[PDB]
Design an enzyme around this catalytic site. Structure first.
Site, PDB file in Angstrom:
ATOM      1  CG  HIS A  67      89.549 125.498  80.546  1.00  0.00           C
ATOM      2  ND1 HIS A  67      90.164 125.862  79.369  1.00  0.00           N
ATOM      3  CD2 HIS A  67      88.896 124.341  80.290  1.00  0.00           C
ATOM      4  CE1 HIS A  67      89.897 124.960  78.442  1.00  0.00           C
ATOM      5  NE2 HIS A  67      89.129 124.025  78.975  1.00  0.00           N
ATOM      6  CG  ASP A 167      90.406 122.085  75.168  1.00  0.00           C
ATOM      7  OD1 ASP A 167      90.620 122.983  76.016  1.00  0.00           O
ATOM      8  OD2 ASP A 167      89.327 121.975  74.547  1.00  0.00           O
ATOM      9  CD  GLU A 199      87.037 127.076  77.579  1.00  0.00           C
ATOM     10  OE1 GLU A 199      86.893 125.834  77.623  1.00  0.00           O
ATOM     11  OE2 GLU A 199      86.994 127.712  76.513  1.00  0.00           O
ATOM     12  CD  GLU A 200      86.005 122.625  76.954  1.00  0.00           C
ATOM     13  OE1 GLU A 200      87.222 122.386  76.868  1.00  0.00           O
ATOM     14  OE2 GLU A 200      85.331 123.021  75.983  1.00  0.00           O
TER      15      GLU A 200
END
Ligand SMILES: [Zn+2]
Ligand SMILES: [Zn+2]
Ligand SMILES: [Zn+2]
Ligand SMILES: [Zn+2]
Ligand SMILES: [Zn+2]
Ligand SMILES: [Zn+2]
Lengths: 340, 337, 340
Positions: A67, A167, A199-200
């Protein structure tokens, strides 16, 4: 080469893209994807994917997705005194939020410096303006994206990196490197390689890309918290993760067999990992007719902060493991993964 | 006979994600009474029963194969295991309980539990991590309750584990048999979902794959009779008008209530506090009107669930009449907007 | 052989005898004691003892006692809805009481399957009856005993066992094996060999047996909590216990000398153990003119539950130690224990 890997990591982790605003990261991926893939496609929400066609007769669709977005903040109001109040985009520990550099990203293209000065909605965010009017006069509006500002640097022993957004720029690089590595190769699967949007904020892009591309099998590429330093599990330098459990996803037996088989044959260093958070696989595996999944992963210390610390070796292991995985995925092996 | 049939299903071990043993049972029991046996991406099994009727609507009927249990999150140096819960456990019922730990290499190793679930000691009688590992045990291993099905003194009730939802599994098996000869006004999809205990996961995938117009979950729910709450063991099948995940639509209610009177079915009204496969399934595709043909049972999600055989008979007769009466007329009525 | 031991252990632990109701275990001990013993006597409360007469001139009486009762529950009332509320017999941690199988033992001899569904008095005990009337029609009355229902099984490595009531069918079996192994041999003491009633409710049998048989030296045979798994002392497989202290009993120096001397001459593996609970020795030693004591012990994980875990190896060390002690107990040695 380690000197090169770092440069590549410095580039991707210093790109600035908060959930729903990942055009800079998409632009980067498009430029790295296009030359090693037949076709570059996009989902409704902004996710990019390279399609790598297969000569194999019943070539099964395999989707590999990281992502593009990173945790950040978003302006909710501009106070009369010129300061901002924010809403978190992605999950933040309020313990880490105060006294931090950021970049506020204006719609008209300004990149204005902003710092934070314990509820998030009460934390003062400050661009050094004298009032609402001046802030507004620099193009700033409610809804403007606020991205962490943190450069990538090598640790003293030169094994590790300190940076923001590992990330999931790990997965962005991992996807990029994969395309480069498989360029010459011809696979037994129809490969859809790329990266998700949003995504987060709740695995949102993984809903839409998995639906659009109808893969039989799905590999998320994503990194997770390393608790080694906190007496928890996930130890930096111990290799790639076998994610057997997280609250949103269970590793299926058929997939487990293939992961452990492939790791053993390609001489990969791995560690078992019990996830506490979710990855794209959580949403993806529930799409269409059902899609067996895992997440090809690295752990890292202090995820979702300005100062994530992680091992370069872990990436190499994870990359090789992703390479071997997609090379070995074909009609026979996915049928075996899905043997019911 | 009903008891043995219940003894068999309830004693099978299948935690969420690991339901091959229950799939093997349903496969063997579905195949002879069905035209085609199909599978979704995650491992749900369904028989298809073709209808001669023109424009025959698709009906999905699904229980779930998985039961609650635990999974090894790590092996301690001393050889014990710490676990994560697979399905919702009330931490009061977890301590001092027998389990079967299932290895990848096929071992079945006896494990007992000795407050947060992650802090509870799971013990296999090993000297150290090495010994546990030398028996094939790895993080990720499935841990299934060890409890047998028995008769209560009056021989009207059963005590066992996993009546949620080997009820629905047996219910789906007995349906296939009863409908063997019969021909229906609907394109019947008959079977059981995967991974219901961890968030109705398989219910998404099976419903999306088989594009049904109407959905019938078959699950059991808590009985509160003994705690003064609602849901009374022995008062028949459940009319589930509400739960946090799903509202029983008027069309479906009329069809449920009407059928029940016609077939002389004993039933009790029932407001649900937890979800069923219906919560997820009804939101798939263009939308799929749903319910859950349910039985209540005391002490669900434990080693010691207690339930009435009669209730099973009631729900069975109810399921049969329902799918028999389901055709183009009646599903159009249900969806009369 | 380890397979014959498991059989003997499976036997003793599967019998049903809550405090006050130990006829089943007494029937077992009568059958095992009589052939190997001169005389079988009983106390006022139900304890059974074999008397092995001695040829030695001033032979001291030696009492060796385990206890027959296990922990369970008792029907306090039958509710109108057919369920039962109970009162504990023996100390239960309420955390382990919910969702457990039991056998309710009726006066008219029925055995009715009962399960539990946090104060103990508030816990629902369920027989699956329609109402108070139907429960009573099966002969169920306030007072009926409710015994844990749990079979005995080997652990994967076949060194340990999982069962109920190792406390104290351990000592029941220890007393049985003692009788068999000493049959024919002749001791320097007048041996009283048997088992107490009602230990779990307050060492109550130990009061009456000790008073009746007037021993000079007393050996309790009882198992205790292993703490190993919780970072506490008492470790499975580390041997028979040297109970130097517990809240109700102090190991006297003369007795300690005898214990250590004996163990060390007979190659016994042992571990020191500071007890946090009481055993028959606490009552027995205060009886008559005073009676020096210990408890020939073994630890086990998760005592007072359906799922106790223990080592067969430990039983063998305890048994060898018991034999060595009773064989070496005579006028010289008990006089030395009592050297004041
Ligand atoms: Zn992530
Ligand atoms: Zn994240
Ligand atoms: Zn259920
Ligand atoms: Zn459930
Ligand atoms: Zn005891
Ligand atoms: Zn005790």
């Amino acid at each position: 080469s380690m000197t090169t890997l770092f440069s590549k990591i410095k580039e991707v982790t210093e790109l600035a893209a908060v959930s729903g605003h990942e055009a800079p990261v998409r632009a980067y991926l498009r430029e790295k994807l296009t030359p090693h893939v037949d076709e570059v496609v996009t989902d409704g929400l902004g996710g990019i994917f390279g399609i790598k066609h297969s000569e194999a007769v019943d070539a099964p669709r395999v989707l590999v997705a990281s992502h593009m977005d990173e945790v950040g903040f978003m302006v909710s109001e501009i106070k009369p005194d010129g300061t901002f109040r924010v809403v978190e985009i992605g999950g933040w520990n309020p313990m880490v939020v105060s006294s931090q550099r950021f970049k506020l990203l204006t719609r008209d293209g300004h990149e204005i410096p902003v710092i934070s000065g314990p509820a998030i909605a009460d934390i003062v965010f400050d661009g050094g303006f004298a009032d609402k009017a001046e802030a507004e006069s620099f193009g700033i509006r409610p809804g403007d994206t606020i991205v962490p500002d943190s450069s990538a640097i090598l640790t003293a022993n030169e094994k590790n990196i300190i940076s923001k957004a590992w990330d999931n720029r790990y997965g962005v690089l991992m996807v990029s490197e994969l395309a480069e590595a498989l360029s010459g190769q011809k696979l037994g699967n129809e490969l859809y390689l790329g990266s998700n949007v949003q995504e987060e904020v709740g695995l949102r892009g993984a809903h839409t890309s998995t639906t659009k591309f109808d893969p039989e099998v799905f590999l998320a590429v994503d990194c997770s918290p390393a608790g080694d330093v906190y007496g928890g599990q996930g130890k930096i330098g111990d290799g790639t993760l076998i994610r057997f459990y997280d609250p949103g996803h269970l590793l299926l037996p058929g997939m487990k067999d293939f992961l452990l088989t492939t790791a053993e044959e390609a001489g990969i260093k791995y560690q078992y990992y019990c996830g506490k958070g979710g990855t794209d696989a959580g949403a993806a595996h529930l799409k269409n007719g059902g899609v067996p999944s895992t997440t090809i992963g690295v752990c890292a210390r202090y995820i979702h902060s300005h100062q994530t610390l992680y091992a370069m070796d872990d990436f190499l292991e994870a990359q090789a493991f992703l390479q071997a995985l997609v090379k070995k995925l074909d009609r026979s092996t996915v049928d075996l993964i899905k043997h019911y």
